[PDB]
């Protein structure tokens, strides 16, 4: 056969091309089709096959390699097929791994690889995602997310099931991608039989080689259509107004072509779209300008909105007049991995919404920050795809050269590392500080993550992983959610706590449209509970399950109740996965009776045990401002909270830092219940400032006096 004729780590590019062009495909002993032949011809015409011989030589001569190439060159698809052909997985028994940043992108790449190889999806080419493993025992190439690769490394850090691993889209600098890169570097240092490939599209090839200790770097050439870059004469305070004026000027004077504008938020994008529609109506009324189709692509858009954004531009009102234009106000979707046909003009305000987690108070926020040079280059590359384009930025050239950073901040510094520390402890990395990491996090952040793990009983005082930490690492959720699910058997509310944890892991299901805000508020009040936002979410999930059992349409019921059907399905799948994991681990599933009055108290106690770290207490009876004990954070309650009366203790699942500091997803709890749930974290002997800890100590003294009175009376 072709695989038997090809040698491991010695297959030539001509031999691989002959095996691909052969009428008998030996992956499953099948016959090649016309679509497979067309895909092979396209891969040969692409620049990946021109440098395929050099890539194979570099992979044979070096265990770790870096390939830097432009988008569309074929590094995501043609490199893995050639790597698998050179590795010959039938003679080794180990598969090929393709690490990707996005699960949907990994699934699309796996489907494209299966279509190119003329094999069924999951048989030879497989896809691995969160709670979705579409693979079989005969799979040789598997595309998996960075989180899936991290979970596989935590399950078995030896990585014996994978012979060659290629991590693509490494320029995103994700925390899981960095952890996977560190694990791959450690595996390459331990055993030389594993092949490591790093695919990049930026100018960080030298940095990647320095991280991989002078790995062989292969550059894939290939250009695209030209883009003329223009800069504003000065920095504008009103970025939205400047973008609106630039879009109006492009519609009035510039030639035909779609224009993509860089916005920051969903409400700002909607307001800008309304203003652009009013301006286009005024221009049509006065100067008889051409038609303009406004399309929003912010962080909260539906598939219908995405299809309307990807739809064609409107036609001109009259022949020979101003041509029609499509103004797509996108937030960050169109910056990278987006192909919009007809896009010619780009408006870059230089501001985008990025997520940052400050470890000083452990507060996560989505703040508007200045754009980077990499983001500007990505926007310029997105503009002018099929033809020559123009990209105008609202910042000076000197400002973009100096003030704008070369690369964006990484997700390791933008988020916490408690899950990474738990995964390293499960895999066996005792020396986390001395671990071979190219871009490790801060020592203060690592100490905070280890302290959080010790508070959640993921690690002991010496940093060793206990059985609770092993169970938390095995469970595909946060350590706090795993601790809540573990402690739910004591509270006898295991099913409700698992549903709440699944809903917290899944995205927000509450839909509050601007034109249906009253209907959304009415639905939230109908499906809400006075115990807390977690109780309201549990009641909404129970109502959705009851509607599904009764036979009503899930999407129609979600639309009627202002809910998200996709988020509800994701929460149901996460709850099913958590129940399967609990059944595998022997965790009992119990639920309190509905007629029992202690069900809400048990649920509140389980929530307090799960998330006792994020607990806030009211500063005064006349003040609505709460004081979270995490570094004494003064915050408020979010307006989406369903609790009409604020509680003495509010356990908050999420903390959002904005212009007004508010806490969302707050459940009612008492200080005595919190101290009973977590006596180690809420110890009065180690209690610091201030009066909140003094009140907790007073409540503990009152509980001790009550216990003494009960012992005296008994």
């Amino acid at each position: 056969s072709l695989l038997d004729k090809l040698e491991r780590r010695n297959t030539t590019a001509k031999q691989a091309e002959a095996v691909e062009d052969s009428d008998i495909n030996p992956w499953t002993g099948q016959r090649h089709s016309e679509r497979y032949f067309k895909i092979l011809k396209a891969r040969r015409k692409l620049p990946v096959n021109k440098q395929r011989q050099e890539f194979l030589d570099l992979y044979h001569n070096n265990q770790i390699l870096v390939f830097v190439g432009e988008t569309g060159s074929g590094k995501t698809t043609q490199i893995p097929q050639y790597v698998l052909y050179d590795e010959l997985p039938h003679q080794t028994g180990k598969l090929i791994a393709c690490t990707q940043p996005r699960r949907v992108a990994a699934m699309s790449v796996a489907q494209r690889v299966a279509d190119e190889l003329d094999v069924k999806l999951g048989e030879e080419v497989g896809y691995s995602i969160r709670f979705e493993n579409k693979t079989s025992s005969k799979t040789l190439l598997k595309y998996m997310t960075d989180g899936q690769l991290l979970r596989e490394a935590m399950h078995d850090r030896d990585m014996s099931r994978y012979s060659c691993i290629i991590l693509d889209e490494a320029h995103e600098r994700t925390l899981a991608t960095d952890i996977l890169m560190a694990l791959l570097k450690q595996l390459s240092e331990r055993r030389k039989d594993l092949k490591i490939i790093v695919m990049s599209a930026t100018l960080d090839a030298q940095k990647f080689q320095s991280y991989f200790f002078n790995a062989p770097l292969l550059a894939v050439p290939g250009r695209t259509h030209p883009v003329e870059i223009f800069y504003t004469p000065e920095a504008e305070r009103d970025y939205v107004e400047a973008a609106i004026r630039t879009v109006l000027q492009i519609h009035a004077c510039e030639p035909e072509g779609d224009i993509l504008l860089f916005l920051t938020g969903e409400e700002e994008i909607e307001d800008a779209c309304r203003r652009i529609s009013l301006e286009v109506d005024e221009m049509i009324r006065e100067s008889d300008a051409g038609p303009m189709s406004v399309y929003p692509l912010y962080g909260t858009l539906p598939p219908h909105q995405q299809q309307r954004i990807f739809e064609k531009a409107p036609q001109p009102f009259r022949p020979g007049g101003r041509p029609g234009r499509k103004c797509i106000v996108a937030t960050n979707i169109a910056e990278t991995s987006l192909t919009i046909d007809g896009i010619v003009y780009v408006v870059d305000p230089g501001f985008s919404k990025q997520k940052i987690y400050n470890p000083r108070t452990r507060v996560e926020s989505l703040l508007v920050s200045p754009i980077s040079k990499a983001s500007a280059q990505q926007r310029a590359g997105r503009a002018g795809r099929t033809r020559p384009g123009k990209c105008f930025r609202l910042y000076t050239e000197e400002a973009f050269k100096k003030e704008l950073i070369e690369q964006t901040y990484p997700e390791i510094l933008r988020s916490n590392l408690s899950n990474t520390v738990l995964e390293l402890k499960k895999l066996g990395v005792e020396d986390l500080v001395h671990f071979d990491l190219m871009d490790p996090p801060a020592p203060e952040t690592m100490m905070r993550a280890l302290e959080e793990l010790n508070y959640l009983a993921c690690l002991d005082d010496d940093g060793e992983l206990t059985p609770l930490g092993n169970l938390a690492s095995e469970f595909p959720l946060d350590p706090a959610l795993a601790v809540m699910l573990i402690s739910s058997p004591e509270f006898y509310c295991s099913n409700e706590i698992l549903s709440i944890t699944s809903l917290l892991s899944v995205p927000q299901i509450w839909v509050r449209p601007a034109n249906a805000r009253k209907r959304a508020d009415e639905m939230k009040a109908q499906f809400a509970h006075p115990d807390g936002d977690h109780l309201t979410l549990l009641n909404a999930y129970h109502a959705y399950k009851g509607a599904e059992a009764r036979g009503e349409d899930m999407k129609k019921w979600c639309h009627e109740h202002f809910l998200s059907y996709r988020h509800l399905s994701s929460a149901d799948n996460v709850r099913a996965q958590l129940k399967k994991i609990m059944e595998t681990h022997g965790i009992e599933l119990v639920s309190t009776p509905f007629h029992d009055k202690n069900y809400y108290t048990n649920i509140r106690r389980a929530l307090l045990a799960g998330f006792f770290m994020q607990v806030a207490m009211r500063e005064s009876s006349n003040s609505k401002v709460y004081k979270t004990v995490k570094d004494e954070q003064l915050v408020l309650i979010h307006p989406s909270t369903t609790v009409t009366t604020p509680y003495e203790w509010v356990v908050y699942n999420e903390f959002v830092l904005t212009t007004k500091q508010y806490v969302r997803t707050v459940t009612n709890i008492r200080p005595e219940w919190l101290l009973e749930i977590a006596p180690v974290y809420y110890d009065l002997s180690t209690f610091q400032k201030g009066e909140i800890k003094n009140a907790l100590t007073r409540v503990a003294e009152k509980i001790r006096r009550q216990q003494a009175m009960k012992a005296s009376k008994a």
């Binding site: 108070t361 973009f400 203060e444 690592m446 180690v680």
Partner: protein, 63 residues
């Protein structure tokens, strides 16, 4: 189990100090963390966390 103190203790000036008596600090010291130097194979990582800039809403780059 002893009540482990928080690693990032907020002072009266609003700054978070790394308490060396914390369990996380003890684990980092046992692993080989050095004060003023980042972790990793060669210590090339960032020694400080990413700070979010409080830029105005609807404000362009460089403003």
């Amino acid at each position: 189990r002893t009540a482990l103190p928080s690693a990032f203790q907020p002072t009266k000036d609003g700054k978070t100090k790394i308490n060396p008596n914390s369990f996380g600090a003890r684990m980092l010291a046992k692993m080989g963390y050095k004060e003023g130097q980042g972790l990793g194979k060669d210590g090339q990582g960032r020694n400080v966390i990413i700070e979010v800039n409080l830029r105005p809403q609807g404000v362009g780059l460089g403003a």
